[PDB]
């Protein structure tokens, strides 16, 4: 082994917008493979937290603007391997998903990787030796500004000073997988 597998996901909006994750996603996410879970928020209820605890015994969640649990922290900074990682739902970032506001957050937090959600749009890019991840929405839940949403989630394989970011997407009725490498 020796790799740290980190699941990244959020904006499920269960059950108000969606009842479950895609069946094909549930087949991939099985106990005993993932070390840590970093959740951007908007679960939105304890049942989804409970489900995440069956997948890994180290679960991190930040508070979304539709989360029921107001005890979640607003943002969180964690260290996995050599990487310092920052986590924010993103509805605080003004305007929605502006690259300038996110870069501001990165310097404020002093992280190698900045994870955020709220736009329900997967992105993963490198900007000034800094890495930015949006997992999208793992259920394909609509939001304001967008209704035709591709369900997705991110898997980070952290080893030494490389992060290998897998992106999983339900396109049509099948899972498509891409990978992006980021160096520290």
């Amino acid at each position: 082994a020796g790799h740290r597998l980190v699941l990244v996901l959020g904006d499920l909006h269960i059950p108000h917008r969606c009842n479950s994750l895609p069946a094909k996603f549930k087949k991939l996410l099985v106990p005993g493979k993932i070390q840590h879970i970093l959740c951007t928020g908007n679960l939105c209820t304890k049942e989804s937290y409970d489900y995440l605890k069956t997948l890994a015994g180290d679960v991190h969640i930040v508070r979304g603007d539709f989360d029921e649990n107001l005890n979640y922290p607003e943002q969180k900074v964690v260290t996995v391997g050599q990487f310092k990682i920052g986590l924010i739902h993103g509805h605080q970032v003004i305007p929605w998903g502006d690259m300038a506001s996110l870069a501001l957050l990165q310097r404020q937090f002093d992280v190698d990787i900045l994870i955020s959600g709220h736009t329900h749009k997967f992105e993963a890019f490198e900007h000034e030796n800094k890495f930015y991840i949006n997992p999208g929405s793992a259920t394909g839940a609509y939001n304001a500004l967008e209704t035709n949403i591709i369900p997705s989630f991110v898997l980070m394989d952290i080893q030494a000073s490389t992060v290998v970011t897998y992106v999983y997407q339900l396109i049509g009725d099948d899972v498509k997988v891409e990978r992006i490498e980021y160096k520290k």
Binding site: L29, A124, E178
Partner: peptide, 15 residues
């Protein structure tokens, strides 16, 4: 940024 596709069954969740 450098988005390479990944062959069937080569992602961590499948072997």
């Amino acid at each position: 940024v450098q988005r390479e596709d990944v062959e069937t069954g080569l992602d961590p969740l499948s072997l």
